[PDB]
Amino acid sequence: EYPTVNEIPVGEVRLYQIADGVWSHIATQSFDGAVYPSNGLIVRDGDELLLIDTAWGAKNTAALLAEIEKQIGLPVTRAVSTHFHDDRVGGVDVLRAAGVATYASPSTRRLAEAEGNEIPTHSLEGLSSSGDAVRFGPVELFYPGAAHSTDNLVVYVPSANVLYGGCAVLELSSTSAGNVADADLAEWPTSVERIQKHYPEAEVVIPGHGLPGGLDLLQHTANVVKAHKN
Ligand code: NA
Ligand SMILES: [Zn+2]
Ligand SMILES: [Zn+2]
Numbered sequence: 663e664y665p666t667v668n669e670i671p672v673g674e675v676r677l678y679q680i681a682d683g684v685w686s687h688i689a690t691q692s693f694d695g696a697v698y699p700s701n702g703l704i705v706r707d708g709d710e711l712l713l714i715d716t717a718w719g720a721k722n723t724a725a726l727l728a729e730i731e732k733q734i735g736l737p738v739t740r741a742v743s744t745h746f747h748d749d750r751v752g753g754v755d756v757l758r759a760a761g762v763a764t765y766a767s768p769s770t771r772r773l774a775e776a777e778g779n780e781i782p783t784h785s786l787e788g789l790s791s792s793g794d795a796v797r798f799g800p801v802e803l804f805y806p807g808a809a810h811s812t813d814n815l816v817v818y819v820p821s822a823n824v825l826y827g828g829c830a831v832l833e834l835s836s837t838s839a840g841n842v843a844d845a846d847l848a849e850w851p852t853s854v855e856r857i858q859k860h861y862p863e864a865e866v867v868i869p870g871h872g873l874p875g876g877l878d879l880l881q882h883t884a885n886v887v888k889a890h891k892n
Contacts, residue, residue: 664688664873667699675717675726677704677733681822683800685734686868687726689717691749700749700871703826704730704738705819707800713741713762714801714817714826715870716753723753727760738762740799743782744828745814746773747844749870754780765798767805769813789815793856804860806830807853808846809887810839810870818861825864830854832883833872839890840871847891851884 665676665688676688683706690699702715711734717726730738741757743750743766751774754764764782766774767789774781788796792807802818810829817826830853832839839845846853858880867879 665699667697670699672697673721673725675722675729677729680824680866680868680874681819684819684822684824686826686874687715687717687729689719689722689726691718691722698871701826701868701874702750703817703819703824703868704734705800706734706736709736710739711736712799712801713738713757715744715750715828716741716757718749719752720756723756726753727756740765741782742766742786742798742803742815742817743770743774744817744826744870745811746770746777746779747811747829748779750828751779751782754782758783767813767815770815773811773813786815792853793860795860804857806856806860807849809850809853810842811844812846816857818864823863823865824868825857825861825866826868827857827870827879827883829870830857830883831867831869831879832886833869834875834879834882835872836869836882836886839887842890847887850887854880854884854887 685704765784766782789805868874
């Protein structure tokens with residue numbers, strides 16, 4: 663079953679199979695003293711893998727690559743970071759040094775640079791406006807509008823009907839929107855509505871932190887964020 667913070671010591675990574683050729687990766691990291699789990703995604707594309715998000719730091723990301731080689735045995739050739747925070751880009755230097763081509767939107771790259779985070783090598787164009795969608799290997803990348811951050815992207819895997827929301831989507835047990843220092847609380851519910859409208863057929867929704875669920879994670883996120891904003 664789906665691993666939680668208690669089952670993953672900081673520095674270890676678990677993989678969880680979501681569908682044929684689709685896995686989440688789960689890592690843990692200390693932030694402001696406390697340990698949190700974090701998810702990303704792995705998608706098979708023929709005999710190579712596309713990585714979505716780092717495992718939140720260099721050591722975790724090196725462990726991620728090791729766990730991928732052990733469990734899956736296919737090379738990660740490209741990676742996309744879904745926003746500029748450390749749980750998404752921390753580890754990019756490890757990926758790049760391992761031969762993985764790293765990508766993010768221009769906005770994410772600029773914000774990462776400004777924050778002193780690692781910076782993905784390549785820009786993902788065509789994602790500047792809310793509702794924009796582009797194909798990238800076996801996934802579609804979608805910019806729903808500002809939410810957890812202004813740059814946040816979501817990822818859909820058409821072959822599996824799996825929607826990876828990153829931090830624009832919250833898990834069902836969540837009662838608050840979490841770290842909102844960079845968030846746009848006024849726009850976030852609208853951004854979620856765009857996701858709902860564009861991916862009504864999604865069967866699994868994976869949040870950036872915590873348990874995957876169904877489409878209800880989307881409405882739940884809008885609700886929490888509205889209640890948070892008050
Ligand atoms: Na690899
Ligand atoms: Zn974030
Ligand atoms: Zn986060």
